Structure 1
C-alpha cells in the first residue's frame, strides 16, 4: 500500500544506522502481512510512525561565531560570566573539532538569578532547538522511559518527543528543577536519569516504547537546581556543577537600569518621558527593599512603581510623574530594611559578628551579661535559637576563654566563678554554625575585662579548643554585610585569604583586612 512508501521516502534525508534500518525493514514486512484494519496493524503503524519521526541523522545549523554568540548572550542577561564563559568554551571546542558536540551541565544557585531564563538565550545563541523539561514533583518514570507497545496508550516518553518535535538530533534540553524531582513510591524517576545523563551511555539510550537505542551524545543537557545536596550522588557526579553566585547591589542596579526597567516599561506601556526612574531612586529601592539575592522582588517593585505611575497618568491625576527618593514611599510604601546596625557603640561584653543569610548576608551581635551579682564554679547560659553546632561552638569558646584568661591575667577570676548569660539578639530566627566561635570568645573576654572592642570592628571564624582559627564559608556575604555597616576593620581566618581576594575590587576597597591563625592575634587586634 501507499503507507509503506509514505514511511520509506521520509528516511531519504536521514542517515539511519543499520541497527535501526533492520528493525524498520522487519516492521514494514510485518505491516504488509497483517490485515489493514486489525489492532496489530494499528500497533505496527504507530510504532513505525514513531521510528520514522526520529531525526536519525540531521542536526541544527549550529553557528560557531564567537562574536555573534557573545552579542546574543549579553543582550538578555547581565554579569553571568561563568555560564557565558562555559558556552564560549563550548563554541570554541565545537569549532576546533569538525562536528557538533554535546554536554551535560547543571546550573545551581539562589532563586531568581536567571538559571531558567539563560537557557533560552543560550539556545538562541547556539541556534539550537530549545525544549523545557520541568521535573518538579515528577514521580512518573514513564515520562522518561515510556511504555511498551503492548499497552493501549503507549508513548515513547518526553525525550523521544523532544527529538520528534524539534526535528534535530542535537537540541538543548532544559531539565528544570532537577533537585525537586519526586520520591515516587511505584518508581524513582531520578534513577532513570542515570541512563539519560550518562556521558558515555548517551549513545545507547534505550527507550521502552521504541526498544531501539538513540544517540543522545550530541544533545546539550542543561539542568537547573536550587541546592546540589538533594540531587542523588550517582546523578550529581555525572553532571557538571557550575554556580551562579547571585547579584550584589551594584550588579542589581546594572540589571535594573539596563534590563528590568526597559522590560517593565514595555509591559506597562509607558515611556521614559512619562515615567522616569533615576539611578538614585533605583539605588535606594535596591538598598531598602530588595536585599534578596535574586532580582524577582526588585522586578516586582519596579513594576509596582510603574503601575502606580500608569494609574496616575491614565486617570488624569498628572500628565507626567517623576520618582524621587523623597516620594518613593508613596509608590512602594515605607522602607523595609531601614536599619543596618543594632549597636552604634558597643558596650563591654558585646561584639559585632557576621552571618550568612538568604538576604545577601547580615550582621549579628553577641551579647553577654552577668546573670548573678558577683564578678562551685561559673556557668554559661546560651539563648537565641542557637543550633546544636552553634551551642557546641559556644561551649568550646567558653572553655578557651577560660584558658586564655588563665594565662593572660591569672588574677582575673571573672570567667572561672561568674555566672554568664550569652545571647544573640536575633532571638526569633534560628542560627547555626561554628563561624561565631571567635566572636563568642571576644564577647566573653570583653565582659571579663570590662573593655569594649574596637568600635567599628567585625569578625568571624571557627575556633578550636586550643584557640586555632579555622576557615569558614560565606566570605562574600559576610563582607557585604560588614561593608553595609560602618565596619572599618574586618578579621578573617588566614585560610580565607584566597577566597577573600577572589572578591571583586569594589567590594573590599575600604576594609582594613586582618588575617589570623590563632586567637592571640585577634586579641591584639580588638584590644
Structure 2
C-alpha cells in the first residue's frame, strides 16, 4: 500500500504535466495530493479526495484550440453552411479580426434571438467548425436549479460538478464554444433562479475568476465564447440582457426559403435517407408549392419535415420497384403529402365594414391578424373589448376609442353613430405585451370604418400606436411585420414616420411589391385607408 500511494501520485502528475495549472490551483492540488499520499486507500475520504483530484487534473489548464484562423477561409465555411444572415456573418468576422490582431485567444458573449427554426442552433455548429474550436450545447430552459451550474460540494457524499465544468472536462481546451438555450424562459421558485448563477457566466469581471462548489478554485472563463439563444428579447432578465451583446436574427421569405431548400434542405434529407440525385428529383416549383401551401412559420422548421417526408416516401418506393426513379412534380405531389393544407391565408379575402388588418410580432415570428367590430343595439355609449387583453391593452384601447370619438365628430359632426351607440371590438391574441399597442391605429380605423358604413382599402396592413391627440408613435419588430405582410398577400403597408430607418435597412427584394406610407398623424392614415 505504501509504495502504491506514490504510484497513484505521478499518474495524476502526468495528467497535469502538459496542463500548466495556475499558481493558486497548484497550491490547492499540492495540498490535496500530499494528503492523498498519506491517507489510507480503503477510506471513503481517500476516494472523495481522489475524485476531487481527478476532475482538477482532468481540466485542460493552459491548453487551447489554437485557432488557425484565415479571414476569407472562415467566411467560406459560413457561406457553405447557411444562406443569408449577412449581419451575423459580419459580426463573426469582426470577432475573428479581433482575435487575430491580439494574436491570442479571447472570449466574447453573443446572443441570438428570433423566431424558431431560423438555424440559430445550426449556425452555432457552423461557427465552432469555422473557428476550429470545440463545440458544446446546453439548455437552461425552465429549470429553477442553481446547482445545475454550480454543482455540489466536493467533500459532500456523492459529489457532482455543474454542467459548465462537466463540458470543460470532455472538451480539452480552456476556450470552448458553449451554446446556452432558452435564456428567455429561465424559471424562478423554491431553490432560486439559474439567472443568479449564470450572471457569473455572462459578466466579463466574473468571467476572469469563476467559482463553483465542486472545484472550489477561481478559474478563467473570459476566453470562452458564450452563445445564448432566445425567441423574444423582452422576457430575458434585465441585468443579463442589458449586459449581454444582443443580435437579432430574422426569418425568411419565399425566395429565401426556396434558396435554403434547394441548396441545403434537400441534400440534407438525401444524406439521412442514403439517397442520391440519380434516383430522387425535385424542381423549384414543387418546393415553391410546398412552401406556399404547407407551411406558415417564418422559420423553415415545418419545411424540413415536408421535404424529409417526401424523400422518405420515395425511399420505400425505390426499394419496392413501383417506379425506378422518382421525380416529384405538381402533378404527382398529391401522392406524397396529400391535397394542399393551407390553400388560403387571408381568412377575409375582401375585408367587410369594420374589419381591419393588423401585423403583430409573436415569439413564433411575424403574424398577420384581423381586428373585428360589432354593434349590440340622451345617454352615453360604450365599448366592450375581448381577447386575452392585458391591463396595458385595456388602457390603450380606451385611448383608441377616445381618439375615435373626437376624430369623427371633428371631421364629421352629423355622424353621431360611434359615440351614441354600443360597440364590441375584438383583438386577436398572439400579440406580445410590448407589441400589443402597435395595432392601436388599426383599431381606430376599424371603428371609423364601422361608423360611416365604409369598408377599408383592400389588401392594406398596418401598425402604429396612437396618442390621444392622434400622434402616430414608433413601434418595434418591423422586420418581422413586413415578412408576414408578404405572405399575407399585402400590397400596401402603413408605418410610423420614425420607423423609416428600420424599413430601408431591409434587403431590396423583400420590400419589393409593397407600397409604403410613413405617417406621423392620423389624418394621414384616414386619407390613405379611405381614398374617397
Q: Answer whether TM exceeds 0.5 for this pair.
A: yes
- Asked whether the 8 Å contact 1:173–1:222 carries over to 2, the reply is yes
Question: Offset at 1:280?
Answer: 0.7
Distance in 2, Cα, partners of 1:140 & 1:347: 52
> How big is the shift at 1:421?
4.3
Classify 1:379/1:214 alpha carbon distance in 2 versus 1 (closer, same or farther; 3 Å).
Answer: closer
Tell me: CA distance 1:379–1:95, structure 2 relative to 1, closer, same or farther (3 Å).
same
Return the offset for 1:385: 5.9
CA distances 1:109-156 after superposition (whole Å, capped 9, x unpaired): 222222222222211111112222333344443332233332232233
- Give the C-alpha shift of residue 498 in structure 1: 1.3
- CA shift digits 1:72-123 (9 cap, x unpaired): 2222222233332222111100000021101222222222222222222211
Give the stretch that moved more between structures: 227-236 or 100-109.
Answer: 227-236
- Deviation of the 1:217 alpha carbon: 1.6
Give the distance between the partners of 1:335 and 1:387, measured in 2 at CA. Answer: 37
* Distance in 2 of aligned mates of 1:349 and 1:37: 83
Please state how far the C-alpha of 1:301 moved relative to its aligned partner. 0.4
Match of residue 382 from structure 2 = 379
Q: Which residue of 2 aligns with 1:129?
A: 134
Alpha carbons 1:293, 1:358 under 8 Å: kept: no
Contact 1:384 1:430 in 2 (8 A): no
Q: 1:322-343 CA distances to partner (integer Å, 9 max, x unpaired)?
A: 2222432332122222113344
Distance (whole Å) between structure 1 residues aligned to residue 481 and residue 64 of structure 2: 48
Residue 471 of structure 1 and its aligned partner are, at CA, apart by 1.8
Give, in angstroms, the shift of residue 395 of structure 1: 3.0
1:461 aligns with 2:481: no
Q: Deviations over 1:231-282 (max 9, x none)?
A: 4333333432222222222221111111110111221232223221111111
Decide whether aligned partners of structure 1 residues 283 and 201 sit closer, same or farther in structure 2, where only a CA change above 3 A counts: same
Q: Mean Cα displacement is larger for which, 314-323 or 491-500?
A: 314-323
> In the aligned structure 1, how far is the partner of 2:340 from the partner of 2:346?
15
Aligned residue pairs total 525
- Of residues 432, 436, 442, the one that matches 1:433 is 436
Query: Are residues 220 and 489 of structure 1, via their aligned partners in 2, closer, same or farther at CA, if it must alter by over 3 Å?
Result: closer
**SS of 1:386's equivalent?**
coil
Deviation at 1:304, TM superposition (A): 1.1
Q: What is the match of residue 204 of structure 1?
A: 209
Cα distance change of structure 1 residues 203 and 477 upon mapping to structure 2, 3 Å threshold: closer
CA contact under 8 A between 2:252 and 2:483: conserved in structure 1?
A: no
Assess, with a 3 A threshold, how the Cα gap between structure 1 residues 319 and 369 changes in structure 2: closer, same or farther.
Answer: same
- Counterpart of 1:356 in 2: which secondary structure? strand
Paired residue secondary structure (2:262): helix
The worse-fitting range, judged by mean Cα deviation, of 99-108 and 394-403 is 394-403
Match of 2:82 in 1: 77
Aligned counterparts of 1:180 and 1:363: Cα–Cα separation in 2: 25
Q: 2:380·2:420 contact (CA, 8 Å) conserved in 1?
A: yes
Contact 2:253–2:510 (CA<8 Å) still a contact in 1?
Answer: no
Change (3 A) 1:476 1:325: farther
Q: 1:285/1:4 Cα in 2 relative to 1: closer, same or farther (>3 Å)? A: same
Deviations 1:344-379 (A, max 9, x none): 44454444443445665344444445544xx92444
Following superposition, the deviation at residue 483 of structure 1 comes to 3.3
8 Å Cα contact 1:386/1:431 also seen in 2: no
**Contact conserved, 1:463 with 1:470, CA < 8 A, in 2?**
yes
Distance 1:287 1:357, change over 3 A: farther
Checking the alignment, whether the CA contact within 8 Å between 1:107 and 1:241 is kept in structure 2 is yes
The alignment's C-alpha RMSD in Å is: 3.1
Farther-moved stretch of structure 1 (22-31 vs 66-75): 22-31
Shift of 1:462: 1.6
**For structure 1, which runs of at least 5 residues remain unmatched after alignment?**
none
Give unpaired runs (5+ residues) of structure 2.
1-5
Structure 1 contact 384–427 (Cα < 8 Å) conserved: no
Q: CA deviation at 1:2?
A: 2.5
> Is the counterpart of residue 106 in structure 1 residue 111 in structure 2?
yes
